[PDB]
Amino acid sequence: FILIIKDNIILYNINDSINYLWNIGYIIMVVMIVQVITGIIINLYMNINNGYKGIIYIIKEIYYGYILRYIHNNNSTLIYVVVYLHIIRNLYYKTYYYNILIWYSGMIMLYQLIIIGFIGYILGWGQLSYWGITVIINLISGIPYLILLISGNYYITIVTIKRLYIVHFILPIILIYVEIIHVYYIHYLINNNIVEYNVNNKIIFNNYILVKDNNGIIFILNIFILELNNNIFIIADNDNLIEINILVTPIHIIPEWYYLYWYSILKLLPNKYSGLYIVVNSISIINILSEYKIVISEYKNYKNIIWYNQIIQYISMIYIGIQLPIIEYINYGRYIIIFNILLLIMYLYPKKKK
Amino acid sequence: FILIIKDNIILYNINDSINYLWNIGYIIMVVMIVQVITGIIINLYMNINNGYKGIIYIIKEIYYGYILRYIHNNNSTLIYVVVYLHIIRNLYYKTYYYNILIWYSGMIMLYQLIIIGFIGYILGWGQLSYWGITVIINLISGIPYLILLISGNYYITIVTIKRLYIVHFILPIILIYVEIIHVYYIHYLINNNIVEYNVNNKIIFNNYILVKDNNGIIFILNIFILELNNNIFIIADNDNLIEINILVTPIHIIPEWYYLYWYSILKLLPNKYSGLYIVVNSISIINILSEYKIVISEYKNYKNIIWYNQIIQYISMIYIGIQLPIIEYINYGRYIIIFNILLLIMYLYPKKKK
Amino acid sequence: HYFATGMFGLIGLAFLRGTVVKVVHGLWPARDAIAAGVIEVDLRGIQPGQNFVVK
Amino acid sequence: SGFGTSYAHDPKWIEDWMARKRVGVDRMDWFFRAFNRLRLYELFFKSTPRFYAFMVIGGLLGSYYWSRFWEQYWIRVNKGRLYKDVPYVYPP
Amino acid sequence: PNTKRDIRRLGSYPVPPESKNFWRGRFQVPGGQIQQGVSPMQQKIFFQWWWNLPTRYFWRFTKWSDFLIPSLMWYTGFLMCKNDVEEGTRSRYWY
Amino acid sequence: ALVARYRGMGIMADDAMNDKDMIVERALDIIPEDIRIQRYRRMMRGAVLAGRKLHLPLELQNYDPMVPYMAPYIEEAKFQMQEEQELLAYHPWDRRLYTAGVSGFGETSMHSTFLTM
Amino acid sequence: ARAYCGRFAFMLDYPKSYHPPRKNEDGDYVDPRTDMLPKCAAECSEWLTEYNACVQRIKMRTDGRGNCQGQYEEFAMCQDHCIAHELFHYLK
Amino acid sequence: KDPPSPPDWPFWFKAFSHCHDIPSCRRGYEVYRQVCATCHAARFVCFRHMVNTIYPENRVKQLAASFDYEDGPNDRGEMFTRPGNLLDPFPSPYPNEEAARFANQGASPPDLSQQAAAHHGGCDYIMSLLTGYRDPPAGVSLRSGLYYNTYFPGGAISMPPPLNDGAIEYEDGTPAVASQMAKDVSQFLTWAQDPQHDERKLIGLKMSTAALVWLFSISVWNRHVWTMIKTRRIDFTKTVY
Ligand SMILES: CCCCCCCCCCCCCCCCCC(=O)OC[C@H](COP(=O)([O-])OCC(O)COP(=O)([O-])OC[C@@H](COC(=O)CCCCCCCCCCCCCCCCC)OC(=O)CCCCCCCCCCCCCCCCC)OC(=O)CCCCCCCCCCCCCCCCC
Ligand SMILES: CCCCCCCCCCCCCCCCCC(=O)OC[C@H](COP(=O)([O-])OCC(O)COP(=O)([O-])OC[C@@H](COC(=O)CCCCCCCCCCCCCCCCC)OC(=O)CCCCCCCCCCCCCCCCC)OC(=O)CCCCCCCCCCCCCCCCC
Ligand SMILES: CCCCCCCCCCCCCCCCCC(=O)OC[C@H](COP(=O)([O-])OCC(O)COP(=O)([O-])OC[C@@H](COC(=O)CCCCCCCCCCCCCCCCC)OC(=O)CCCCCCCCCCCCCCCCC)OC(=O)CCCCCCCCCCCCCCCCC
Ligand SMILES: COC1=C(OC)C(=O)C(C/C=C(\C)CC/C=C(\C)CC/C=C(\C)CC/C=C(\C)CC/C=C(\C)CC/C=C(\C)CC/C=C(\C)CCC=C(C)C)=C(C)C1=O
Ligand SMILES: COC1=C(OC)C(=O)C(C/C=C(\C)CC/C=C(\C)CC/C=C(\C)CC/C=C(\C)CC/C=C(\C)CC/C=C(\C)CC/C=C(\C)CCC=C(C)C)=C(C)C1=O
């Protein structure tokens, strides 16, 4: 496979005009490898019968075990930041217009990542972990006997932890396989450029693009090392360091920051099932944004007003999730949801002719 | 990859004259998949903090958990029987003479399998498990501070079990990857035939060879199901159902049947290191059997006397391992070792001319 | 001929269904857990006005 | 004769065995002739979707009654030694 | 693959990507040959097993008889050791 | 025993040579057609007999299987190969690696190793 | 891993019928095994004579050294093998 | 020098299509409760395992309720005592191994949960060991508290001969003799090791028989397709139709 490596790294041609926003994908691939490696190493010391006492044991007793603990937690935050920024990037340039297969391959990795991150959060085995999974699992209480089969008991226990751990161990490996389908489609279906059209200015990847990609990934590392060792940003809720009490709920029951958008959607809509369905809508609806267009154009490099409103809409929904369930927040959040629906309809609808 | 499947299964050509001994490889591939699948499922219920109590829990409390427990233990015995028979097959027809790359790829899988099976035996966490690993690990006590790093303590503990479990979980997956290099070399370097020469009688695999291979694998399944449900052959020592006592040794300290050959080699030679080196010799020496030949011939389809003596020599060494360390057995075992060396020299040496 | 090849598939599918169902069945709450999830209240010996707690 | 030597050759009775070719003889034709009257091929096997349905529905019914038959066999062999066969008498 | 002469193709039609291995096992037949066969649906499918049964087992056994002397010698070794072990144990322990 | 095995298959000793050996392959390139035709027919009959677990009729077994019909061509092939070894392969040559489907370590066929897939 | 090796029932010689244990003069049932001990000892007479010889040899020792455990174990194994063939016929 | 191998006792469950003899299992538990339980523990055997398999549910409740189990903490943080229930394991005579050794002259009575399969010979070892107590061999003198058993490794076991005729009265009326009690307790302990033994064999019977039918179908298929190959005729200078 040295001739396959040479055809996809050494003699792989890319346009010269790409920005640093085209370096995000490379960063995702590298940090993903780190998360898998640190996970395997952490499991050499972790105790699944009591995740609470395992983390303490790693941080205090293992030599340099604090590095493994904090890298795995903090690098998961970095995985979602970089992936979400990659999604925003793709939305801005409308790379899905012609490279839809690339978009589909990516969305599968997004769906897998959501499951990976959530179960991992449960493995901490703190107050938020226990109560977060208890709340989410009740959403499927409509389907008979489905909760009992998944949990393995009538309440979440170590039985549930043992089975979720296997999914957390294995699913990330499948995600890496899907990354190869993603790269296959990128190399066959050539990448988009900052300009709409296709132009003859490509250069080889190893001598030029890889050097620029390393410069970007080293710049992100300078920031990640500061967060890793000094916690300049609060990215992990403190409530997960409280021992589980099944009779007393914590002050608030919220997931990590990267699930806040979906958390607020549920907290806002009155009917539980409607909340779940709106969550389904947001991820699935963006898969067919360009499917109804009829004109010869990719809607690229206009003022991108709808795009900007959508990005701010994600940010505001994330902000509402942090706040308590105040009635006034509920009203405004509902307006944002309605506003988001209108924005998506603007994307979908084709234009008539004057 | 549907055109790769079609080129290696549907339109793959093989000679018509092959025997059922050419079906062994297919059986290894299928039973290997089963062992990986049943292992993953067993880990949904297994307790690594006390492997002794986990097995009891699976056998008694899990629905159909006895099937998982016995299949995983018994199918490991079947994996070694089929693999060893495949090795004997390759030795008999001297398939290594021209298809050495196939032989090398196979030996790597043999080396990995040895490690996989041994650590898995330790995960049982019985008397033999604890004392078997304690004895084997002392062989490397010569290398300073190496035992402490491997065991993670001054004696084998759950700390050692946690790290060995990760190797047992991951190494089999790497073994499956090496199976693809093995099949790549088989399909490129065409397989050998029952006759020495290469003849024009090949037929497609899916319509003819796969039907015959299924007939063989279903015949082996009829035998495996009898052993699985009724234990017609004692293939697991009973001493591993005794709880570990670090102060009292069991009646005998022996591995599974498929490690008996190497166990006796150590028990026979007086110096501990010499025993380890002779173990290294047996597996490595068979990698260069044909390297010194100078004549245009593959030594194929003669009376194969040396081959038969070697196979019986393996069987007799396996028999001596079962017996206690009686002095008389030690003497005879040493003669067998000397005899085995002479047989290998017969294989290696080229002939002069009268 | 097609009966024979059909029978191979018939038996194979039956073995496949049994395997799948049995594996999924193992995820159901185990015999110890199902047993612990049922407590019987012997209302015998309680006195009017008494409150007792059962986990 | 010649068994066990380089002169080994097929004995006479093996040669006579291989001289019986049974050309133009079919002693099992009745079985296929009667089997064909079940019309399984016309009804089920010929069409792929119906071929699948035969395997699925046949496996469903076959598996159930196969289990049922051997459960009765087990009950007969172990008669008088099963828990259900020996109702327990409570001590006084 | 086979020799270069064997796999050298006469036709200029390109090798399909799904038949790469199939055409690496090509042979260059010298002098031609006539191949004939009949569909299994019009043949006896089990008689050949019975017709070939006695000769198959005769030739199998005569070949395996080559290992008679080696196996007897190993078996003779097995018996000596087993009874050398018994005598040793009794001499060292029994009174 | 070897003579009997050859006579049972109806093959000659020189038929038994495997063409995976390079000297055999180079010799087989230059054998005349009449020798080639009978060699192929004998080898095909042998494989059919061996595969079907049958033996050649004794009526056809009275021949000497050890006639060395390939000897002239094996010796020519060895001479050709020794000339090539000496005049063209007397040093470990440096070539650009993994280019044009070939590792650059000496083999001449494209896609003939695992690392050149 | 498991308690026993399975076999066909024809290989297992399970008692066809049950004979009740003999009763003592006092009225308490006598152990079937004790009744069978004298018979099985006779069937193992060869090993017993070897054990009996050892007892006499160690008796005629000025030193205190000497044991006959090895011969006794061979006799005991033989006697028990005899008992196993017939004991379950007297046990419910 | 390895311990004498037990004889092959003809237990009912040894055959392929045979179950555990429940009446013998019932008698085996009586022996264990009244004889073996004084010194040995069955940590991994729970009362619920016996419900609807050996005894009816009400009967098992009475057996469990006979014993007292330390349970807690209560609201004041104290440990209290309660009668047993179906969820409890079999009671342990001693609180820890050190206590067991002290009461048994330094010998630890092993847990009997898996002893039926933990020795070479399996169930046969239990039956033979219980009935393997003979007078010492001439020239072998045992320190007090050691007894001669032909099957225990080394010949000297710290277990007093546990079975004596008339030790217990069987509920079903079976005569109580040493050999009978050894047979029953061996049966019961075999069941305790693997209570799913009957389920395994009944399902195995269906699989094994079905696999034979599956072998016939693939064989017919294999014969059919290979007839195309094994009957071909390749001619060179000849032609026959
Ligand atoms: C890679 C390598 C390979 C890897 C492999 C993987 C390895 C993984 C590791 C291993 C993991 C561990 C586990 C390993 C386990 C291995 C062992 C194992 O699996 O064992 C399983 C299993 C072990 O046994 P078991 O599982 O305990 O047994 C279970 C029971 O047997 C049966 O089960 P059950 O009892 O639970 O269920 C029984 C039940 C199950 O029941 C069902 O499923 C039946 C119901 C299905 C209903 C379907 C309805 C579908 C249609 C719906 C409607 C559609 C409408 C659409 C409309 C559209 C409109 C637009 O069926 C019945 O009760 C039977 C009767 C059914 C009657 C149905 C009547 C239907 C009426 C419909 C009426 C509708 C009218 C409507 C009108 C109104 C409309 C408005 O194996 C077997 O049993 C082996 C069987 C093999 C086959 C045997 C048969 C052989 C036959 C031989 C024939 C040749 C001889 C011929 C002789 C001829 C003589 C002349
Ligand atoms: C008490 C304390 C004691 C301390 C003691 C400390 C001792 C330290 C020992 C250090 C190591 C010494 C090793 C000596 C070996 C001598 C063997 C010999 O006589 O060779 C003659 C022999 C010549 O044989 P010949 O029959 O006359 O002609 C050969 C051809 O048929 C026809 O030949 P031709 O000349 O006609 O063909 C032309 C071609 C012929 O080309 C070849 O023969 C090349 C063959 C293919 C090589 C690539 C194999 C594929 C990759 C394998 C590795 C896979 C995994 C790697 C990554 C894993 C990452 C997890 O020649 C050239 O291309 C000439 C230039 C070659 C150099 C090119 C430089 C760039 C490439 C870099 C790789 C090659 C570096 C040189 C070899 C290094 C040997 C260790 O040449 C070779 O053996 C060639 C090298 C092949 C082996 C490469 C092994 C690499 C290392 C693998 C790991 C080893 C671990 C095991 C323990 C290592 C320590 C011992
Ligand atoms: C008294 C004390 C004695 C101690 C004994 C031990 C002595 C120490 C040394 C032992 C090891 C020796 C290594 C020899 C290296 C030979 C290199 C070489 O010439 O290779 C080419 C050569 C081919 O020759 P060629 O055809 O002439 O070369 C011309 C072509 O250009 C050649 O090109 P080609 O393509 O035809 O062939 C290349 C061939 C070369 O490879 C091989 O054949 C295997 C070579 C390596 C062997 C394995 C080494 C393992 C040891 C290191 C690990 C130890 C860990 C320890 C940790 C401890 C922790 C507590 O295949 C490959 O390169 C396959 C590569 C597959 C890689 C797949 C990786 C996964 C996919 C990619 C990455 C993952 C996906 C991305 C994921 C991203 C995530 C986002 O290889 C062979 O023929 C030999 C293969 C090895 C045979 C067995 C060797 C036995 C050694 C004797 C001693 C054994 C003692 C008993 C051991 C028992 C163990 C249980
Ligand atoms: C209550 O507060 C809240 C939170 O905090 C608690 C939230 O996080 C959230 C948002 C949370 C989320 C959006 C995610 C929640 C995630 C959950 C509940 C994960 C639960 C666990 C699972 C789904 C594990 C089961 C795993 C899978 C089904 C695999 C998933 C991946 C899939 C299906 C993609 C493709 C399929 C695969 C990769 C499977 C591959 C299968 C194989 C290899 C099988 C092979 C088998 C053979 C025989 C060969 C909300 C809304 C909230 O309200
Ligand atoms: C005492 O009684 C006795 C026994 O019973 C106790 C015996 O069994 C035996 C015989 C026993 C044996 C022959 C086997 C004994 C096995 C033992 C001791 C296993 C100990 C555990 C290990 C070796 C685990 C460590 C694992 C490895 C080193 C991997 C093994 C496989 C190898 C090296 C093949 C190729 C390498 C790999 C597959 C590793 C792959 C590496 C990666 C993927 C790393 C990637 C990393 C990055 C950064 C990308 C004897 C002689 C005996 O006397």
Ligand code: HEC
């Ligand atoms: C009731 C009839 C039984 C049964 C079925 C068993 N015992 Fe005992 N036992 C005791 C002690 C101290 C030991 C330790 C071993 C020795 O003494 O050195 C044992 C051991 C066993 C075993 C295991 C034998 C071995 O291989 O270690 C078994 C299967 C066994 N026992 C069964 C002590 C006692 C008692 C105290 C007086 C009583 C009562 C019993 N045992 C009763 C039984």
Ligand code: HEM
């Ligand atoms: C994209 C890949 C993955 C991500 C997003 C991820 C995410 C996380 C999260 C957020 C945590 C809990 C953080 C905390 O404790 O608060 C966690 C824990 C854990 N993960 Fe992962 N994980 C991934 C891959 C893996 C892999 C491949 C393994 C093992 C091979 C693994 C093993 C573990 C283990 C053992 C824990 C428990 C340690 C803990 O308390 O942090 N993870 N995971």
Ligand code: HEM
């Ligand atoms: C595990 C997460 C993923 C990784 C490893 C990853 C990696 C990559 C890389 C390396 C590229 C090529 C270089 C680049 O454009 O930066 C890229 C391109 C692309 N990705 Fe992803 N990706 C991931 C997630 C996603 C997701 C979730 C989507 C869709 C919502 C997506 C859609 C795309 C698109 C459309 C392109 C084309 C870029 C272009 O045309 O310029 N990716 N990705």
Ligand code: HEM
């Ligand atoms: C060729 C592949 C493998 C073989 C040879 C093998 C061998 C075995 C052996 C012999 C046992 C112990 C048997 C006994 O308990 O006495 C064992 C246990 C175990 N294995 Fe594997 N194994 C393999 C693959 C795997 C895989 C892929 C996994 C997990 C994904 C796995 C997970 C386990 C677990 C959890 C146990 C403990 C359960 C036990 O007590 O049996 N194994 N292995």
Ligand code: HEM
């Ligand atoms: C995980 C273990 C392995 C599996 C999956 C496996 C599988 C296979 C299969 C499918 C074949 C092709 C069909 C066949 O000839 O039966 C084969 C061929 C072969 N294998 Fe393996 N193998 C294994 C272990 C080994 C080992 C340990 C060796 C060498 C000691 C070996 C040496 C060979 C050779 C020489 C051939 C060529 C057969 C021929 O030329 O006819 N294999 N193997």
